[PDB]
Amino acid sequence: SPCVAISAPGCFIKGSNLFSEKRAGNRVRFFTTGRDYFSDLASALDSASSSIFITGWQVNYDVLLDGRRSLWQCLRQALERSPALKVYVMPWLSPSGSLGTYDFETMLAVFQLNAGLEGGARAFCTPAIQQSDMQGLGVAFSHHQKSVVIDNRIGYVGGIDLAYGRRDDNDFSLDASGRRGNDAYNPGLPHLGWMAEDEHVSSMGLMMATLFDLSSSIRAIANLIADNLDIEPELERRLRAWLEELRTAALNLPEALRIKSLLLINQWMSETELGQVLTLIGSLFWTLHRLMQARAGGHQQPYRYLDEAPQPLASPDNARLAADQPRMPWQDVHCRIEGPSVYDLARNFIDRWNGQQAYLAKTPALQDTALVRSALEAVMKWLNSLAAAAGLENYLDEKRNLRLELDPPTPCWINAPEQLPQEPEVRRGGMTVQVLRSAAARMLEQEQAGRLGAGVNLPLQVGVSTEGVQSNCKDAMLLAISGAQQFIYIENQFFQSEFGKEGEVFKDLPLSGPMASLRDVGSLRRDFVVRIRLEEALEQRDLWLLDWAEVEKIAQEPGTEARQFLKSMLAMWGVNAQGWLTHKLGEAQHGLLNEIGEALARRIERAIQREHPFHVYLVLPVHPEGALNVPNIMHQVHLTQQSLVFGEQSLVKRIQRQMALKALEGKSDPAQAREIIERKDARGRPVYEQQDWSRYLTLLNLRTWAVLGGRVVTEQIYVHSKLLIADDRVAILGSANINDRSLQGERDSELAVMVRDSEPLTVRLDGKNDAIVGKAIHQLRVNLWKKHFGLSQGPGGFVKPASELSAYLSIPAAQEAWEAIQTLAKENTRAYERTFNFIPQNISQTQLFEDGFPASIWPTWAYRKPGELRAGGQLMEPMPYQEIFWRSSNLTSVKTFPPPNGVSGFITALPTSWTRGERNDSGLNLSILA
């Protein structure tokens, strides 16, 4: 019975900003591997006969779905099979190609789906502009939903984008050598191998096959700005004199020349509309979009390297992981839904699509159209010059006499009855599903305008809202947390949640040693810094104010220190400058806003008060995907550790204070009790820190290791899931991270489902007392635990199965279960740390403080002076984000590592002391990181 019935109060969310109401009668299939979701999707695309809707934060056309065909090939085969079928692809329109989503390339690939299709175009791609309420900071926000709907009858939703690196299985293999192109995925490592140019498609190759029917960089960028220059009259004159100076420069440019080049180039890419399009590679973009869509659609056949000879997309520099370099394994959860709630998934896609169409199709003012037209001629001047240089001049000549292409961005509505879903009849039984959104007030307004423009008003349930911010994902998590009776299991990419005041940062250390090395001018060599007047140029936020005469003399100064200084100085400038920009774009919040951490602690506090058992499992990534020496990554780690342990009102401290206060219950009245528990102990720590919070909370990371190319290697298993289970009775699955960006509702858009199974299963969650739970929810958690314990892998692993834990799979609320899980995780971590000093961990192994010195954000870092921590420091041994970790240099040789001994399962302990004392503040606007 517990929450089984559809009238049961407190089981699904209600209130004033619902995207949907719960519906019974669904069939849900859960995917616990990306391989299984992609394989299931390929099969469903092979059945599609009417419509295919795809939206995602990242959509990569060349990703293999079924081991043989790309997403693109599966879409093309469906269009050829079903003459009435239409395809719509809505990837997030990222503001920079540097985010690695490749939406621009996928867009061109989608255009090619129409090449040679009998009849008109039936494949459409509209990349989706963020519709947040964050005003000037909107550029930092995204559409983060991951959803696919086929024939308005099969709906997919969860955390898995159709993207590089997402496909993976129960082996979490580190070998990347069989992955194709960018699907060999590890953003934290330098990529020291080569993608052969004749086996990979370049973006330019793809553009060239879009425009025509084919069936150092400083001097390079300079000669490009030259041809399109003949712009604010001041920048023109600097660019006038700049070009003349290059024409007489030496093969090796003077340093002052080489830096004012990158200042002038950076001004061009950011200020003029032409360079603004290349950084995306304005309504210039949409006019280009229409032109390219129309050209590709007239071609006789799709580009050969999409279909006849499918090759992966290359990376921008054709670098890839070398044979000895590990991929980063991908942990994620997704599902497939059939039944009434597919209607709500279809409604999300259709209303979003039509809202984007209404937005982009608005007519500009004549003076704006005149600027877009002018920039388009140049953009088409640039693209046509590359084509000439690529030996495609004959294709250029054949188009000389055609009509000037400038058709207006026109709305492509989804409004034919065949593409629209039918309002479902009420059902009973099966799975009850409620579709949840995070969506900004601005988003809902554009959706209303798309309903008006397309003439589409899909019937809504009563009490569904079409106005105001939707924060359904946060509200459903809060409901599940407060309603939980025995335990909660959470997998999430993030734990960033309101934690009170920042805590534990060492006095006399305004910035951590590592962060100061990236941000703080006082960490550079002072004699070079004072000579070029760097400090003062930073104070006035203008790099032109350096003493360029001293810049060139240091540039010639022989040895190591002088060549290095200018490099680090310029990198520091960029970090500082990004900090200044993000604070100018919009107001910064103070601290984190979402209350997930408080709500988990509040539920544990109730257990403490009642003297009842309760437990929360949190499974999180070791650290955000990417390299640990990137400031925004370092800052997210900082906020994670504050949210979990170091903040004054962190999850662990909220729990410990409540345990301490209960120990004093009756003995003392309040107010005084709150002061007695703060009294500092022998080592200077508040006495409530003696409370064993591990009775209530287990924190886990995932890790594996292998011998790759004759070398011992390790990598985090990236927990990308966004999954919450309570009591094996409800699952919340979707795209919403535990951070402000996902949960507040007015920032990134998100999509999720709350699922309950009406099919009962009798279990003993705590090992003793019978409980009726949801059969498929229970099975989902059991499958995830089998996977993380190493019980689902095939033969030939380096990590053994943790078969000692199979006894606990069905009793997650038993104290014996979490105690066994904690013990094995701690033992795995000890085995890893015996050989790897560079992984996140509690105690520094290189600094050589009763337990020792806490390990730094860069674990091989040591501070020069324990007394004056602001004296700086250095990496004592390489970090994996460095090339010398992987490849010998003239003075260093590649260090090796003994294999870990005794690791069973992939679970490891989250290091609750990692970075204690360090303020890893990137200087970026906290609202962008929150």
Author numbering: 24 to 238, 328 to 342, 346 to 396, 417 to 983, 993 to 1074
What does the published report state?
As a cognate immunity protein, PA3488 can inhibit the activity of PldA to avoid self-toxicity. PldA is mainly composed of 27 α-helices, 25 β-strands, twelve 310 helices, and many loops, folding into three regions: the core catalytic domain (CCD, aa 24–935), the peripheral helical domain (PD, aa 215–441 + aa 647–721), and a small C-terminal domain (CTD, aa 936–1094).
Here, we have determined, for the first time, the crystal structure of the full-length eukaryotic-like PldA (PldAFL) in the apo state. Moreover, the imidazole group of His855 from the HKD2 subdomain, mediated by two water molecules (W1 and W2), indirectly forms a three-hydrogen-bond network with the His167–Lys169–Asp184 pair, thus stabilizing the active site. The B factor (The scores are negatively correlated with the stability of one structure) of the PD region is extremely high, suggesting that this region is structurally dynamic; in line with this observation, molecular dynamics simulations of PldAFL showed that the positions of these helices fluctuate. In PldAFL, the α11 helix stacks against the α4 and α9 helices, and these two helices clamp the α3 helix connected to the lid region, thus stabilizing its conformation. In PldAFL, the lid region forms a short 310 helix (residues 120–122), packing with the β2-α2 loop and the α8 helix. Our structures of PldAFL and the existing hPLD structures show that they adopt an “open” conformation, with the potential lid region draping away from the active site and allowing the accessibility of the active site to the solvent and the substrate.
